[PDB]
Design a binder for this molecule. Structure first.
Ligand code: HEM
Ligand SMILES: C=Cc1ccc(C(=O)O)cc1
Ligand SMILES: [Cl-]
Length: 393
């Protein structure tokens, strides 16, 4: 039998401090029923990993938010990659894989790193900064829109559109309906920049459109794949870099280990993705009746996966609530797992690595010197404001 819990994983009280409720969710059983929203939940590593790696049974084509696309209309045309199953998913995935490939990383790495060093040097001249606005947001804003090949005007829509996208995966609570109500201008901007004429040659966007003659995608599919990168590519890395700086501020012994070996930067960022998990929850929909962890779940049922909880499950991790930059992180689900595992993870890791590398070489300490403010979102975890003082090395 399935235990029934009344915990609302989309409530502000839950966002404010999710870990006690996540333990309650893990320890209640491998599968729980959340009466507040009539969905099944899995919060342990083993079950989250199993659901992610069974796309036939736990599909994405009926949406990865609460809404079931077989019952309700999506709020925007479905993503051709995130909200598709194999085999429809395979070829657009292949394209984005080759757009966001190792060879692409080689062409952008020097410029991404130069931009990270310049930013830290500029922030060190200020001393007292907001690590969100002035670093976690400013740095990805200074590299990603240009890497995409976006024009300069209208970029103020990028972060609002992303927050709308991740809020829309949630239930129809105030967070979701508020975001959708104010969505029209951001939707208009993003959709217009997805068209080939508006994307600079050499960028990720033009590269997607240039892939439309191999037989893997058609020209009418390319704008939606550009839309995918502009939905998923910015706010996630913003919260990821914010997580990393927040972690280095709360664990000064780890900042000091990072300083002494800056080659730890890539794993320091990976551990921050596990520790804070910028993408906290995602849904699947069962395509049949299925046994999961000794539990039978009917067909057509939504299953809420707790990625951040799987990443703190003491059944899988030693000392899961410690930030440890030399941890063996392989297997964490902060980027997902299986056929949909984050196709932009090389970009994310590049941004985070070069930013933590710059801090490792230029910063002696990071001290919180003001009120920390949390940013609330139905799917994303991160901070609104992180007042810090940077001490130059
Ligand atoms: C720290 C940063 C990031 C995190 C935590 C993150 C998280 C995730 C997760 C958990 C998934 C799996 C979704 C699912 O299984 O339903 C995913 C997929 C995806 N991500 Fe990321 N992501 C990050 C950065 C990026 C970047 C930088 C890009 C693009 C430049 C990107 C684009 C995508 C896309 C297009 C998908 C769909 C993949 C598919 O369905 O095959 N993400 N991301
Ligand atoms: C992991 C978040 C995510 C959001 C949007 C999309 C998309 O729009 O395809 C993909 C991934
Ligand atoms: Cl849209």
């Amino acid at each position: 039998t399935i235990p029934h819990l009344a915990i609302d994983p989309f409530s502000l009280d839950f966002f404010d401090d999710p870990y006690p409720d996540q333990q309650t969710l893990r320890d209640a059983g491998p599968v729980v029923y959340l009466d507040k929203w009539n969905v099944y939940g899995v919060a342990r590593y083993a079950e989250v990993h199993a659901v992610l790696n069974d796309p036939t049974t736990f599909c994405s084509s009926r949406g990865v938010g609460l809404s079931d696309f077989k019952k309700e209309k999506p709020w925007r045309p479905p993503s051709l990659i995130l909200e598709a199953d194999p085999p429809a998913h395979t070829r657009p995935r292949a394209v984005l894989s080759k757009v966001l490939s190792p060879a692409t990383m080689k062409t952008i790495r020097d410029g991404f790193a130069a931009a990270a060093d310049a930013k830290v040097d500029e922030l060190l001249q200020r001393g007292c900064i907001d690590a969100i606005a002035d670093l976690a947001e400013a740095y990805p804003l200074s590299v990603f829109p240009d890497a995409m090949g976006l024009k300069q005007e209208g970029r103020e829509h990028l972060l609002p559109y992303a927050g709308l996208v991740f809020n829309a995966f949630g239930p129809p609570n105030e967070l979701r309906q508020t975001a959708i109500e104010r969505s029209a201008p951001h939707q208009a901007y993003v959709n217009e920049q997805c068209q080939r004429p508006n994307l600079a040659p050499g960028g990720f966007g033009a590269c997607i459109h240039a892939f439309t003659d191999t037989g893997e995608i058609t020209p009418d599919e390319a704008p939606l794949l550009v839309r995918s990168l502009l939905s998923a590519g910015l706010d996630t890395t913003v919260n990821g870099i914010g997580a990393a700086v927040y972690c280095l501020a709360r664990f000064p012994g780890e900042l000091q280990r990072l300083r002494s070996d800056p080659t730890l930067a890539r794993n320091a960022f990976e551990e921050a993705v596990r520790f804070e998990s910028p993408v906290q929850t995602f849904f699947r929909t069962t395509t049949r009746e299925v046994e999961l962890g000794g539990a039978v779940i009917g067909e057509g049922e939504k299953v809420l996966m707790f990625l951040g909880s799987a990443n703190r499950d003491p059944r899988r991790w030693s000392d899961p609530d410690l930030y440890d930059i030399t941890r063996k992180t392989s297997g964490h689900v902060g980027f997902g797992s299986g056929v949909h595992m984050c196709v932009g993870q090389l970009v994310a890791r590049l941004e985070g690595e070069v930013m933590l590398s710059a801090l490792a070489r230029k910063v002696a300490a990071i001290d919180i010197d003001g009120p920390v403010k949390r940013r609330f979102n139905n799917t994303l975890r991160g901070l609104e404001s992180l007042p810090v003082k940077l001490t130059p090395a």
